[PDB]
Design a protein around this ligand. Structure first.
Ligand SMILES: C[S@@+](CC[C@H](N)C(=O)[O-])C[C@H]1O[C@@H](n2cnc3c(N)ncnc32)[C@H](O)[C@@H]1O
Lengths: 94, 106, 98, 82, 328, 76, 98, 87, 107, 94
DNA sequence: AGATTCTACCAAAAGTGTATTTGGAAACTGCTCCATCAAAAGGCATGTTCAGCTGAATTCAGCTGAACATGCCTTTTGATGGAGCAGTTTCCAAATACACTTTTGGTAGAATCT
DNA sequence: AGATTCTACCAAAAGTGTATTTGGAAACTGCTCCATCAAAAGGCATGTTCAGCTGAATTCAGCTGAACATGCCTTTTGATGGAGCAGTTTCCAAATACACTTTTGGTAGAATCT
């Protein structure tokens, strides 16, 4: 039964940042754990945010506030800009 | 058809992130931009750690990132260290650090 | 007969172990310990190999970080020798005893 | 010669852990204290892992049972799934 | 009676009104007086010798009587200097630059004589192009020592405030023009007056000033986009101007061609940024970022220096990254 | 039909194009050899912005002419 | 004139305060500190009175518990006087600065 | 709305006797003179952290009033769960 | 008719708990016995804390339970103290506890 | 808008254990926080548990395991008996 | 030994198209409660004096731990039957979905208790 | 002053009653990968010697507690304007809900590469 992971996407990012750098299996498994962990923290925080405000919907806005609550200073600022940029780009496309 | 990831200019899978959000029981509904924003955040954080990890592999004269490098990158970075303050990176070891009072009196 | 002074080799070992990442407790004895503890919660259990390894990676990282805090406590009391009361102080402040 | 299992965590193994932890000199009483501390740590984590094992109706403790146990104990571990 | 301090190179005297103007309990007219005379005695030895006579050295800031004797002798000394200089003695040259200690006094007087109510400058809502951040004499000095302003530069201060950064720089250095534009109604009104008090006083001490205009205008105006492209020294305050404000500025900086410098309260991209064009927000891909030396003249509410960053445009780096991939 | 494409590091890369070639094909030729993204690439000649989907004949790009490649950033 | 010896009244104060539950920091001054800090984060905020009391109950519980740990650190060093290094060791072991 | 006094140096409202009292509840018998400033610094960090998150919840809800619940949620996020205020 | 609480022999509201479980987004489905089991546990834990807090109140010659009594009950009970190890009971104060070395005299 | 609380149920239980003992409003507020807190903790542990096992249903069995994971020794034992008893009774009544 | 490259297979996803459903924004507004000014006064904060006794320094000797040489037993490594972890198929107890009908926890307002 | 005592109103609950849907227990079973044994392999246990650390004993400068005089500013009691939180209705932009076509990530096996 299929076992999904972020491995292939982590690898694509690695190549963008360090074209001639590889990553071992154990390291990749660590990165997969990292992505799943941050996904759960951000999602849980967004979930609580919507419930606190009695909203049925988790939108980009709850994801944004979740990011500002969870990530340290500079990391939050860049994550927010990266997220905003992607939703802009995405929204502007037939 | 163009993948939502490509439309967002992302490497991470928007479609999968949307699916994971829906089935994670986080809310009754999930707006269209949420999985895009979240995927972008996950991609960015991933790039940040791989960027510093790769640099650590380099300083160590290695071309392949192993757990040790992820640990060195995270623990030497103030922000990543706090984000992962309660996380243990398997096979990471610790940062070289000896309390000054323990050094011999040269 | 050459002889390093007390402490010289200790310092050498700190440098050596802080550079590496291999586990420091031997595997089989750790595995036996794990199985014995688990048998008290549920008899006739099996363990995936990765389950024991995860327990060892977590247990070792826990003890190593606890030793760091223990060391700060001994140093706080103007010593360079860790003692049981240092581990106890660290655990109490961490809230593992508190 | 027999051997109590927790005694299998030997003085040398404990000293190595202490060295990685930056420790230069160790009191003889540290070894037993450490064993006691390690046992409590394992009892707490294993108890929860086995609780997940039993809930899943399994007879085998999986890495995931351990990962989930560590996570709820505030000891999140990366590298073994999850 | 009033109190006048007669110009030491006979050009546009300083006049202080009667009754004395008190601004706050840290600035009165008299304290300015004492510092002006102090500096002129230090510029010209012969006047110092004379101020000793007819003043008992018992003068004080809060009584007129005490001030009226100090002015009268001083004005009597200035008449002696012009007769001295009218003969065979050579006077001072009006092509001299003010020292740091003197220049500090001149900017301080010009503030006090314009701003007669500082509270009004403190009126801001944050995350707006109107935050009047804490700018210091010392911060502008780090700027003057560290990068040197030449006649092959142009200075523009976007979000100028009163405009004390531009004016300080003009007394000390010279460029083709120096500009200051700030959007806020309150600081602009003050800035116009500041320009006037500042010009009257530079000529009063006989010191060359550079060309400047402190303008009422919007610094984010689309008019500036082409002007910025021709401007190679930008100072831009961004204390808490907000990301939104910062972004729009990052788009406009792109229009600068090489050799430009941008001093801002933040990195636009890391000091230790990796080259490879990846950013979709940052313009700090064509420019190296390094930290200008920390302050003690600004102190935030956190109680730790406010740091400022120098960016130097060198697109040579991005282009080289690409070049490496064509080799061997 | 020969062209030079100048970066401001004073590097000229020669491309062998024909005048029937679009701007979009040229930028693809620059990407092949230096790994440069088309959107980030702004080719300027004679105070005109060379816009994608335009033959080279249109901009009076002939043999041994120097085109200026200025970058920009973009994204979004 | 009568005088309790140094430490006697201190012990009396410990018993008195460990017996009661009222907040120990003056209320208005604490409210101003909260407003000052909040204002530097975001201008024009208003506060429900219970929001300020909640912050005060939490801040005092946090400080009392930190002084307990600090005290243990001083005693660990054979002192009865708490010092900045005790608070710092306590916060470091707690992971507040680690 | 006209004026609104400037708030500054209110950390000094956390006085030496108040800090002494808090240490007494914490069982402390003797206190070095440097403890007061150290404690103010620690309290400021604690408050900045909780208030930052509380206000983040306030802004997200698009309110201008920080509620007891914004504080309770902020405290909970930080592992300092507080009972008694709706949380 | 009869409440699900009466059918289960509980004081706590099974209906309410079922509803709260559904609205909380814990799972796509919530079985009928879940809220019964949960209401029962909540009821049991509240019985336990009130038993001990009323005793603390009696010990202090009071007839009304106040936060201090809830705190004495929780902090003097090993298990409740652990369950609420990271919880602050407002107006609870702390347990009287003076470290030995701080007491005067000797012996 | 009506705001619910466990107050009347806490009061009923108070009366069963200590018939002549009352409770102040602030203590009742603390008891209401306690019940909500444990409800969320148990419900969250149950949610994760079900997700970990790819189950879309939270049954009394997930609540029981969540209770065992969350509660210290003796409290878990007694909570388990009370919940089991409540369900067995519930299911016998219809 | 473990990471990389490549061919082949395909249920699982994910994207597009169609129609219905609906959360929650703007719009208007009732009404709580927050900020603020007032006045009074005493609970406490401040600042000082005085000296008890604590922390910090110095000295020193007992003895515990570190370093190390000597020798074997527990651990590590590699090979092999099955205990069950899972993938598949079957089937109903039990969980949505939906329309009423009835019961009940809040709660607004006034009154007397404890 | 705060709490438990009643009256009346009731929308939001909670419960009772058919129809329809389906999650996952249960049984059978194939394929892992776990437990266990044999032997090739790499520390650990143990006693000796003494360096240097811990902690006891001693001393004293001066910090910090205790007591006190003085009076500031927090606390308390009240009132009031109105910012803004929160209730109510309207109504579309965006989400859920299938149904269908396409692409894609994961898995398995083979073999070369680093
Ligand atoms: C920190 S103050 C500057 C103080 C002065 N420049 C200094 O360095 O001391 C920032 C100024 O930026 C101005 N500002 C913000 N956005 C602006 C815009 N778009 N155009 C012009 N000025 C703007 C504000 O009005 C504000 O006075």
């Amino acid at each position: 039964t299929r076992k999904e992971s972020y491995a292939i996407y982590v690898y694509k990012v690695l190549k963008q940042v360090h074209p001639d750098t590889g990553i071992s299996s154990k390291a990749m498994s660590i990165m997969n754990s990292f992505v799943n962990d941050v996904f759960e923290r951000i999602a849980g925080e967004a979930s609580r945010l919507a419930h606190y405000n009695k909203r049925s919907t988790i939108t980009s806005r709850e994801i944004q506030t979740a990011v500002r609550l969870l990530l340290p200073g500079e990391l939050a600022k860049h994550a927010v800009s990266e997220g905003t940029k992607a939703v802009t780009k995405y929204t502007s496309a037939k | 058809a163009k993948t939502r990831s490509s439309r967002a200019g992302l490497q991470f899978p928007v479609g999968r992130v949307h699916r994971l959000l829906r089935k994670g029981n986080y809310a009754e509904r999930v707006g269209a931009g949420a999985p895009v924003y979240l995927a972008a955040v996950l991609e960015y954080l991933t790039a940040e750690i791989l960027e510093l990890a790769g640099n650590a592999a380099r300083d160590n004269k290695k071309t392949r990132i192993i757990p040790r490098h992820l640990q060195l990158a995270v623990r030497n970075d103030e922000e990543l260290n706090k984000l992962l303050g309660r996380v243990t990176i398997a096979q990471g070891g610790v940062l070289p650090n000896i309390q000054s009072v323990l050094l011999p009196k040269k | 007969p050459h002889r390093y002074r007390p402490g010289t080799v200790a310092l050498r070992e700190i440098r050596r172990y802080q550079k590496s990442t291999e586990l420091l407790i031997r595997k089989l004895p750790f595995q036996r310990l794990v199985r014995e503890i688990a048998q008290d919660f549920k008899t006739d259990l099996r363990f995936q190999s990765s389950a024991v390894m995860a327990l060892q990676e977590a247990s070792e990282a826990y003890l190593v970080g606890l030793f760091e805090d223990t060391n700060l406590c001994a140093i706080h009391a103007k010593r360079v020798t860790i003692m049981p009361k240092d581990i106890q102080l660290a655990r109490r402040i961490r809230g593992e005893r508190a | 010669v027999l051997r109590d299992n927790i005694q299998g965590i030997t003085k040398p193994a404990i000293r190595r852990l202490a060295r990685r932890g930056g420790v230069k000199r160790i009191s003889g009483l540290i070894y037993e204290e450490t064993r006691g501390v390690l046992k409590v740590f394992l009892e707490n984590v294993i108890r929860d892992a086995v609780t997940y094992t039993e809930h899943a109706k399994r007879k085998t403790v999986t890495a995931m049972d351990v990962v989930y146990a560590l996570k709820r104990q505030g000891r999140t571990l990366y590298g073994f799934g999850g | 009676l009033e109190l006048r301090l007669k110009s030491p190179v006979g050009a546009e005297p300083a006049v202080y009104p009667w009754p004395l103007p008190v601004y706050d309990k840290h600035h009165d007219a008299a304290h300015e007086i004492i510092e002006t005379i102090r500096w002129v005695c230090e510029e010209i030895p012969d006047l110092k010798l004379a101020m000793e006579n007819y003043v008992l050295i018992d003068y004080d800031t809060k009584s007129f009587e005490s001030m009226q004797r100090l002015c009268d002798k001083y004005n009597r000394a200035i008449d002696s200097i012009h007769q001295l200089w009218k003969g065979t003695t050579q006077p001072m040259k009006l092509n001299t630059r003010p020292s740091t200690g003197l220049l500090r006094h001149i900017l301080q007087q010009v503030y006090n004589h314009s701003v007669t109510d500082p509270e009004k400058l403190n009126n801001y809502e944050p995350f707006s192009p109107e935050v009047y951040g804490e700018t210091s004499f010392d911060l502008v000095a780090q700027m003057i020592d560290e990068i040197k302003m030449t006649d092959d530069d142009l200075f523009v201060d976007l979000g100028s405030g009163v405009g004390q950064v531009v004016l300080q720089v003009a007394a000390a250095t010279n460029c083709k023009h120096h500009y200051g534009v700030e959007k806020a109604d309150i600081p602009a009104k003050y800035a116009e007056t500041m320009d006037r008090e500042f010009r009257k006083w530079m000529k009063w001490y006989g010191k060359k000033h550079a060309e400047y205009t402190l303008e009422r205008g919007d610094f984010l105006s689309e008019e500036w986009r082409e002007r910025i492209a021709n401007t190679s020294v930008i100072f831009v305050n961004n204390f808490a101007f907000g990301p939104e404000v910062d972004h729009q500025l990052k788009e406009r900086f792109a229009n600068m061609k090489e050799g430009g410098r941008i001093v801002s309260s933040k990195p636009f991209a890391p000091l230790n940024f990796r080259i490879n064009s990846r950013n979709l927000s940052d313009i700090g891909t064509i420019m190296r970022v390094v930290e200008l030396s920390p302050l003690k003249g600004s102190v935030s509410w956190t109680g730790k220096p406010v740091s400022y960053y120098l960016h130097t445009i060198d697109r040579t780096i991005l282009e080289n990254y690409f070049s490496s991939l064509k080799n061997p | 039909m020969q062209i030079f494409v100048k970066t401001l590091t004073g590097k000229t890369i020669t491309l062998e194009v024909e005048p029937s070639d679009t701007i979009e094909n040229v930028k693809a030729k620059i990407q092949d050899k230096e790994g440069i993204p088309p959107d980030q690439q702004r080719l300027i000649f004679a105070g005109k912005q060379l816009e994608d989907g335009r033959t080279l004949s249109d901009y009076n790009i002939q043999k041994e002419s120097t085109l200026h490649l200025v970058l920009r950033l973009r994204g979004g």
